[PDB]
Amino acid sequence: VLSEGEWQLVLHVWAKVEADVAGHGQDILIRLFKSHPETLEKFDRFKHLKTEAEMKASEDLKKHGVTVLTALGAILKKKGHHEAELKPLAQSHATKHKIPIKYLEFISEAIIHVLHSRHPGDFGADAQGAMNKALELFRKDIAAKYKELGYQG
Ligand code: HEM
Fold this sequence. Notes:
The protein is an all-alpha fold. The chain has 7 helices and no strands. The chain is globular and about 45 Å long. The site of protoporphyrin IX containing FE (HEM) has 16 residues, from α4, α5 and α6. One of its GO terms (biological process) is removal of superoxide radicals.
C-alpha cells in the first residue's frame, strides 16, 4: 500500500492545491482536453469549446474543475480507506458517464503535469512517485468496480 511517509508527501502538496482549487481545476481540465481531444466529447456540457481561450473563459468549466478536485481531495485524505467515497463515483462513471479506465489514466497524467508546473519545490521526484502511487490506487480500485459492473474489461 502507500507508506505513511508517501501519504505525507501527497497531502503536503495537496494542501497547496487547496489554496487555489479553481485555478488548478482549470489548468488540469484544459490540459486533458488539449492533449486528448476525445475526452471532451464525453461532456455535453463543454463540447462547444474549441479553443484554449474559450476554455479559460468558461465559468461553468471552472466550476466542474472544482467538483472534480473536491471529490479527489476527499478520497486522498482517507489514505486508502475510500471505499465509501469511491463507490458512487465508479458507479456513475461506469454506467452514466461511460468513462474508460484509460481516460482516468490521462487525467492522472494532467494532474501530475500541473502539480509539477505549479509546485516544483514541493513536487520533487519523491513526491511525484508518491502521487503517482496514490493515483494508481484510485484507478485500481475503480477498475475493480467497473469489472464487477461489466464495463470495459
Ligand atoms: C480525478 C478523476 C475524476 C474525478 C474525481 C471525477 C469526479 C467527478 C464528480 C464528483 C462528478 C459529479 C458527480 C457524478 O456524476 O459522479 C463528475 C461528473 C462527470 N465527470 Fe468525472 N471525475 C473524474 C474523471 C473524469 C474523466 C477523466 C472524465 C472524462 C474524460 C469525466 C467525466 C465526467 C462527466 C461527463 C461528468 C458529468 C458532468 C455534467 O454533465 O455535469 N470524469 N466527475
